[PDB]
Design goal:
The structure is cut from a larger assembly and holds one copy of chain A (234 residues), one copy of chain B (94 residues) and two copies of chain C. By secondary structure, chain A is α+β, with helices and mostly antiparallel strands. Chain A contains four helices and 14 strands. In chain A, the strands form four sheets. In chain A, strands 2-3-1-5-4 form a five-stranded mixed beta sheet. The chains are: A alpha+beta (234), B mainly beta (94), C little secondary structure (44). The complex binds zinc ion. Chain B binds five RNA strands through strand 1, strand 2, helix 1, strand 4 and strand 5. Chain B: One of its GO terms (cellular component) is cytosol.
Chain lengths: 234, 94, 44, 50
Amino acid sequence: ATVQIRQKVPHKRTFLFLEQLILKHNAHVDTISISEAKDGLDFFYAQKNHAVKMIDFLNAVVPIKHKKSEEKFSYSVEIVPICKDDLVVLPKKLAKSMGNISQFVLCSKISNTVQFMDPTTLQTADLSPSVYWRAPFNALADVTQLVEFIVLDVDSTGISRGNRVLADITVARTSDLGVNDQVYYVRSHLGGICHAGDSVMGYFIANSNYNSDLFDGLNIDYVPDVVLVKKLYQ
Amino acid sequence: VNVPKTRKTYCKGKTCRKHTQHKVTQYKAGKASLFAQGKRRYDRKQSGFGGQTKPVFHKKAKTTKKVVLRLECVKCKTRAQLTLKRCKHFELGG
Amino acid sequence: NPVDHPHGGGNHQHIGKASTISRGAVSGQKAGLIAARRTGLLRG
Amino acid sequence: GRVIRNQRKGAGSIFTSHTRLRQGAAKLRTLDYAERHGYIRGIVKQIVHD
RNA sequence: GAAGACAUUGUCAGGUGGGGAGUUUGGCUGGGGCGGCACAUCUGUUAAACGAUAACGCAGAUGUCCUAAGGGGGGCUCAUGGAGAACAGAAAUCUCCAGUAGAACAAAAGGGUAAAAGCCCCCUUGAUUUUGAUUUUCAGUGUGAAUACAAACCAUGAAAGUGUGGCCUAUCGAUCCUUUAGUCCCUCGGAAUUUGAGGCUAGAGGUGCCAGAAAAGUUACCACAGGGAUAACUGGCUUGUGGCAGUCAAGCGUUCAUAGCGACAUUGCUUUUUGAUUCUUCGAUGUCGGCUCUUCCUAUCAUACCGAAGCAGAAUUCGGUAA
RNA sequence: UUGACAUUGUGAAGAGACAUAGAGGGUGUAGAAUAAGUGGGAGCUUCGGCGCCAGUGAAAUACCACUACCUUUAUAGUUUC
RNA sequence: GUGAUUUCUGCCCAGUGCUCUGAAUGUCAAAGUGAAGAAAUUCAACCAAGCGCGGGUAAACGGCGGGAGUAACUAUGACU
RNA sequence: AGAACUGGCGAUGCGGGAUGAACCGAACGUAGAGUUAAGGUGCCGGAAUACACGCUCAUCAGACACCACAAAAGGUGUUAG
RNA sequence: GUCGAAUUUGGGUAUAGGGGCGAAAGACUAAUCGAACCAUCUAGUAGCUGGUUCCUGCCGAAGUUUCCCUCAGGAUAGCAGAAGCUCGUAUCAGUUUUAUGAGGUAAAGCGAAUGAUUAGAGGUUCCGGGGUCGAAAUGACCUUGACCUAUUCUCAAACUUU
Ligand SMILES: [Zn+2]
């Protein structure tokens, strides 16, 4: 029996988490061998129902789709190409079916259903694996597409979710503050952790040059110039 | 792939005829006007009971497209065209 | 046989498709149940 | 394809009603002054089978 | 009497509409179907010492990847093994010697390469403009890819010099139509202006059945032209498998290779099996079995005469002439 | 089958939408402080109201291309129902 | 559709069809309306049915398979 | 079944292989004399029942390549070595 | 088989071709039915079968390349005939020689590379395993594995100096 998992993403973050969760849930205690693959990993077993157990362990945590090949019980799985700190975007029929979230979204955390979050207003949209792999996309970005910011002041606008504030902040670039004073009017959602001198990493939209098929529907006067993501150390 | 948004390249302009800095962009098709002769013809041939009259293409087998660069010369704002190879990816180095 | 009826034909006596026809269905289709809000025995 | 017997049942020619032995058409008498204002009397001469 | 400027009728528009109409429903193919691509292409071998050269021949590969993994220059030398250094171990880092490539050069395979074509760094956009000549495939048509010059402009370098994409060999696309770049050119044909449209030169969107139709099935109700270029039967070549027999003889055989049998190997015969093949027959050779009837063959079940046995008799087996 | 035009004339009530002006509209635990906001913001500018930090602060207010939110009524019609 | 009588006619509305007195703006032709324009035209809003959402329906087409866990052990045409 | 070089049959008769699309010889106007090819000379059958050294006797001898088949293993049958 | 009934039957009458009628077999519809009969369009088209008429003479093939929804077919080059044209032994030839080049097949070789392979013998280890001696060893000796050396047997369409 051979149960194999796959990623199509320029990097790996959900699997750098999977390695952590396997070591605390302990389902590899019976695997004959664990082989790194072109993008993921394969687990070897000698029985069938324990392979049925490992595929259900795989199903237990992350949204997936799972099928069965043969030669010896080959069970393949493809994984959602969505990571914690991504510029993700929901297609038209998917955002009406799921959540009525605006065209721009963020996936703050990963769970059994992939959750989405819009930078402008505060709402969570949980999504099962079926409809996504019925309508596959690749997100517009990953976690390796970031740059650093430097604030002067913070100003929480007072309303707040359990973990969000929709705070308006005045962000300022590091090397630019010293040539120009480019400070924008951008609303932030995680603005409850930022302080009078610390650094946040953010997705610069106002110069980035992307490629995908979902940009031909929206308008160009509603795009935020900047959209931020979680903190590193401060 | 990656292509910087700028490059130094020959300009056929009446005044330059030299290598002058160019801003590159991707080539996007137009709008397919309704008053093009080969659309005023289609719209008439189709007009009636005959049915469909011209072919429609089904048997697509490609998976990419060639990429095409529109190169504007900064000091005479004239333009030029280049093509490249088939690519499943294309971004600029802005 | 199928020339004679929509239900016709078959190497078993089967209708093949539903008997609940529509209401705008035309002459030659309207063979069976016509605007059936319901079928079947309720409990008897 | 052929036309079904239901599509053939609309021109007639064998599917007409067999009206030979019919006593007649069953119809109330006309609305006239006597039935509107007041009444009129009649009498059954026979009960008969149609 | 009722209904009433609604219905009805007329015309346009959208939906529904195998009830109906017209059509189509690839090719190669050891028959045809499924399968697969030998259908456009690449490397080595088939391929038989120039070149060309076939099969559903072999081992494999492509429909991508690259702003550097292109271009130029300067420094340097690899895989590996040996000797050594605290934690440090077969393996981190550091040092020396050997080291003709056994490394690397995006990707298959083959070639090619050492003050480099590889490893590190510096500057960069010759991956540019104009159009021509040539080589390969080849009709000496295209397409694709490449080669060597010219005229201009550029980069690099001290300079020679090199550079017109990837070290070489594969990595891709006509007419029509649409769209963009350009002279700011031509035309809109009674004369003018402005929109709009059409034209010229170079690109892109694509046909992978890859010199490029717009296309689902069934017929056991069936049809037509024709085909033995082609299957299903006999016959014929072949005889793998099947069937039969032989030669060595390791051993079984209470001892005793061979009375009888006999493995590991090995030589053949047969066309009463099945198969392969496709010559004949598709303007027809009446196609399972049984009944009936005749004849032939011997590889003899019996009967006749004989031999040999682990043949006392009896009964059995082996063999012979013999059908 | 559905819609529009015509056939198709005569009327009444209305309900909202359009085109104009008007202002509420605005508002934290806290401050001269009604504010999603905001720039050409050392100034537009009088008492000095102010003044990005004046002070508090969620806003930066003062001038300004500025919806900075209008729930609204009144218009002379167009009338979509 | 089924095919005397007698005895029975089980669980399934996810799918495909049929249906609906159901919420309604997502889609949505022609006309009409508004805006730019010299105009041909272009752009937008509104927008019927139908589609889509929700519900019903099997004597309507039709379908009615798997895996586990219940202590020594035993995993039940039982239960989870 | 499928390729390479050449020669042929096809499209080609003639003498020979009894006969045979392809082999050997040889390529064709009508005729006569002579000479040969390949093959053959017991008779059918035109031509030596010729000469010479030997081998073989088979109760399924053997006898013109292509060609129309025949092996492994054996024999004191015989011959020579 | 049925024979007093869903019976049999004459005559009259209705239904007419993508239409009728059908106790339904795709059955019947004037010896005609998975769509009648008549005439016309119609000399329907056919890359497919068959046939294609007098003599002699001269020359005389092809079944191969490239493309084609191309594989019983066409176009294309070739083969072949005819008409000849300009010239008159050139400078041509399915040929040899002399000179000078290219090739990587046959053979050969692997005590030469890459791979494949039988054998033992000489060594090496602080270092792969075991065994005796052992408190241990960077201790000793047996021993099998490895590699190292010098030989040895046999091979390569996709190995090669030659
Ligand atoms: Zn210029």
